[PDB]
Amino acid sequence: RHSMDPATFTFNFNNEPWVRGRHETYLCYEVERMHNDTWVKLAQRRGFLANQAKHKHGFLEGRHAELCFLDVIPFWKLDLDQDYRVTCFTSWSPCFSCAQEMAKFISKNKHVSLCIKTARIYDDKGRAAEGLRTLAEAGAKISIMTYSEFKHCWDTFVDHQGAPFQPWDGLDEHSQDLSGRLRAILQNQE
DNA sequence: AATCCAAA
Ligand SMILES: [Zn+2]
């Protein structure tokens, strides 16, 4: 569908750091082009997707959300001599292998600046932290989603049918706690 | 310290 189901958004983007039950990953994406040295939104280069679940018929191995996203890029036919900024709002941050693949992509495509804004930090059984450091070293700008970013995703990706964004309890404090943890990760204190 | 991360 054109827009994301609102219950799906609210469940998957909740940012309580240690909450259980989120065994899918959702990713909303938007692209801007640098023109007259301003970032200008490419209206048709935006959307959302989820991971292909493990054991789903026709894709029994599954495919993580970040890989489905990278798959859609060549079909955009981005112009080789223009600078782009690609922003991904992710419900879980990249696992180690996804982080390595996104780092490979940005290493091969230097005209693309990747920003990852995540609701929660995916631990990947202790392996994700090194992957996030590797992705940052390759040039990605990784941050924790804040209130205004959740509201932007509600307003522009969700099938809200006119309902306003309703923040869940503790949103801001969760964002700020996760931001401290991400800072510790990226500077190798964790 | 560990939480948390499809699989019961
Ligand atoms: Zn992954």
Numbering used by the authors: 194 to 383
Wording from the paper:
Here, we present the 1.5 Å resolution co-crystal structure of a soluble variant of human A3G catalytic domain (A3G-CTD2) bound to a 9-nucleotide ssDNA inhibitor containing 2′-deoxy-zebularine at the target position, 5′-AATCCdZAAA (dZ-ssDNA). The structure was solved in the space group P21 and contains a single A3G-CTD2:dZ-ssDNA complex in the asymmetric unit, similar to the previous co-crystal structure of A3G-CTD2* with ssDNA substrate. Given that our structure features the active A3G enzyme, we observed that 2′-deoxy-zebularine was converted to a tetrahedral hydration product; 4-(R)-hydroxy-3,4-dihydro-2′-deoxy-zebularine (dZ-H2O). In this hydration product, the N3 nitrogen of the zebularine nucleobase has become protonated, and a hydroxyl group added to the top face of the C4 carbon. Direct coordination of the C4-OH to the Zn2+ ion is evident by the short Zn2+-O distance (2.01 Å) and continuous electron density around the Zn coordination sites. The side chain carboxylate of E259 makes two hydrogen bonds, to both the N3-H and Zn-coordinated C4-O. The oxygen of the C4-OH, is directly coordinated to the 4th Zn-coordination site, replacing the Zn-bound water molecule seen in the previous structure of inactive A3G. This provides direct structural evidence of the second step of the deamination mechanism, whereby the Zn-coordinated hydroxide has attacked the top face of the 2′-deoxy-zebularine C4 carbon, forming a tetrahedral transition state intermediate. The pyrimidine ring of the hydrated 2′-deoxy zebularine (dZ-H2O) tilts upward ~8o when compared to the target cytosine (C0) in our previous A3G-CTD2*:ssDNA structure. In addition, the Zn2+ ion is pulled down ~0.8 Å from the inactive A3G-CTD2*:ssDNA structure. The A3G-CTD2:dZ-ssDNA structure provides clear structural evidence for the activation of dZ to a transition state analog and explains the stronger binding affinity and inhibitory activity seen for catalytically active A3 enzymes.
APOBEC3 proteins (A3s) are enzymes that catalyze the deamination of cytidine to uridine in single-stranded DNA (ssDNA) substrates, thus playing a key role in innate antiviral immunity. However, the APOBEC3 family has also been linked to many mutational signatures in cancer cells, which has led to an intense interest to develop inhibitors of A3’s catalytic activity as therapeutics as well as tools to study A3’s biochemistry, structure, and cellular function. Recent studies have shown that ssDNA containing 2′-deoxy-zebularine (dZ-ssDNA) is an inhibitor of A3s such as A3A, A3B, and A3G, although the atomic determinants of this activity have remained unknown. Analogous to the CDAs, A3s also depend on a Zn2+ located at the center of the substrate binding pocket, and the deamination reaction proceeds via a tetrahedral intermediate.
